[PDB]
Every structure is written in structure tokens, then in C-alpha cells.
Amino acid sequence: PQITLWKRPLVTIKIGGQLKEALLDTGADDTVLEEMNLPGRWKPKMIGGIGGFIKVRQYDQILIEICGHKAIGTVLVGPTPVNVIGRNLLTQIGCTLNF
Amino acid sequence: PQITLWKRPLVTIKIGGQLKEALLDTGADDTVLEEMNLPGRWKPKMIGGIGGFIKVRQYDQILIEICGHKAIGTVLVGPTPVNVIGRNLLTQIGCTLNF
Numbered sequence: 001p002q003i004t005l006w007k008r009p010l011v012t013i014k015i016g017g018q019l020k021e022a023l024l025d026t027g028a029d030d031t032v033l034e035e036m037n038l039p040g041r042w043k044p045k046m047i048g049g050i051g052g053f054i055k056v057r058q059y060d061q062i063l064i065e066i067c068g069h070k071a072i073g074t075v076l077v078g079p080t081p082v083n084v085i086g087r088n089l090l091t092q093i094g095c096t097l098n099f
Numbered sequence: 100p101q102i103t104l105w106k107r108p109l110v111t112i113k114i115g116g117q118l119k120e121a122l123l124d125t126g127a128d129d130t131v132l133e134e135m136n137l138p139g140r141w142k143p144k145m146i147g148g149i150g151g152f153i154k155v156r157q158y159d160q161i162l163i164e165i166c167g168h169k170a171i172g173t174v175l176v177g178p179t180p181v182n183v184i185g186r187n188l189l190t191q192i193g194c195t196l197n198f
């Protein structure tokens with residue numbers, strides 16, 4: 001679809017078999033989801049945002065469907081203010097900016 | 100134009116008679132720019148993201164040119180690690196997400 005930006009670009013995602021709402025965030029290199037249970041192994045990592053750095057759990061090679069489009073990639077889980085879909089997955093679903 | 104997301108979507112902007120580089124950021128409600136000494140009045144504000152909040156100065160009705168597209172709106176100035184063009188201005192240049 002073509003998404004205008006008068007509202008937040010929020011979409012429904014499926015991860016670990018569960019539906020959630022997430023923000024399509026072209027300013028995020030990485031995908032960061034709020035605290036949740038995910039199966040598989042993970043590794044502790046640090047990511048920095050506008051206000052500093054937080055601790056996250058890095059899950060690699062996770063299946064995630066974004067607005068009906070499948071991706072498989074890295075998902076960081078931690079105290080982000082909102083679920084964000086970053087460029088690592090936006091590229092997989094073929095997302096571009098256009099003006 | 101069409102911008103892919105393999106790399107950060109950085110573009111040149113013109114603001115306050117200065118040229119700078121900023122991200123086209125669909126996850127940013129507002130526009131947040133590096134410290135610069137703009138003229139005129141301003142209101143204090145706090146904006147939150149990964150890692151917490153930063154304190155910024157809110158300037159209204161600021162003229163900004165983004166890839167030769169003109170806009171006018173609110174700009175927040177403060178110790179942000181990256182210049183971000185937010186939805187308040189992206190809507191004005193006709194920017195959409197597409198997949």
C-alpha cells in the first residue's frame with residue numbers, strides 16, 4: 001500500500017504467532033519491540049536512541065509478518081517506548097520513501 | 100524521488116540560512132534538529148525516545164527546504180544525536196511509505 005503520514009504509520013504485525021501493533025520507522029536502523037515472550041535463544045545487546053542507551057534481548061532470524069508481508073530477521077526486545085519496525089525489516093518487505 | 104532504505108535516508112535541508120543533513124523519519128512525530136542558534140522566541144519541551152527524554156527548544160513557523168521542497172512548521176532544537184525530519188514536515192513535502 002501507499003501510506004500517508006498525517007497519522008502515525010501504525011500497522012499490525014505477527015511475531016511468535018501473536019498479533020501486535022508496530023510503527024513503521026524509517027529513522028530506526030533496527031526493529032525494537034516492547035517486552036514480550038519469544039521462543040529461541042537470545043543475546044544481550046545495547047542500542048542507543050535519542051535519550052541514551054537501553055539493554056535489549058537480540059533474537060536473530062525471527063519470522064515476522066508486517067501488514068501481510070513476510071520478513072525473517074533480527075528483532076530487539078526491550079524497554080522501547082513503542083514497537084518500531086526498522087530498516088532491517090523495512091527493506092525486506094520492499095518499503096521505500098517516495099515524494 | 101524514491102529513496103530505498105538499505106542505508107539511512109539522509110538528505111540535505113536548508114534551515115535558518117544553513118544547510119544540514121537530516122533523516123526522513125516516519126517514526127518521528129516532530130522535527131528535531133541539532134543545536135543551532137535560531138532567532139526568535141521559543142517554548143521549552145521534552146521529547147522521549149529509546150533511552151529516555153531530551154530537553155529541546157520549540158520554534159514555530161520555521162521555513163525548511165528539503166530536497167528543494169519547501170515547508171514551514173514546528174522545529175525542535177536540542178542535543179539530539181541526529182537531525183530528524185518528522186511527519187509534521189514530511190506530510191508537507193508529499194512523502195509517503197510504499198510497499
Ligand SMILES: CCC(CC)CN(C[C@@H](O)[C@H](Cc1ccccc1)NC(=O)O[C@H]1CO[C@H]2OCC[C@H]21)S(=O)(=O)c1ccc2ncsc2c1
Pocket residue numbers: 025026027028029030031032047048049050051080081082084086124126127128129130131146147148149180181183185
Ligand atoms: C517513539 C518512536 C521513536 C523511538 C523508537 C521516536 N524516535 C524516532 C526514531 O526514528 C529514532 C530516530 C533516531 C535515529 C538515530 C539516533 C537517535 C534517534 N530512531 C531510533 O531510536 O532507532 C533505534 C532503533 O534502531 C537504531 O537506529 C537508530 C537508532 C536505533 S526519536 O528520535 O526518539 C523522536 C523523534 C521526534 C519526536 N516528536 C515527539 S517525540 C519524538 C521522538
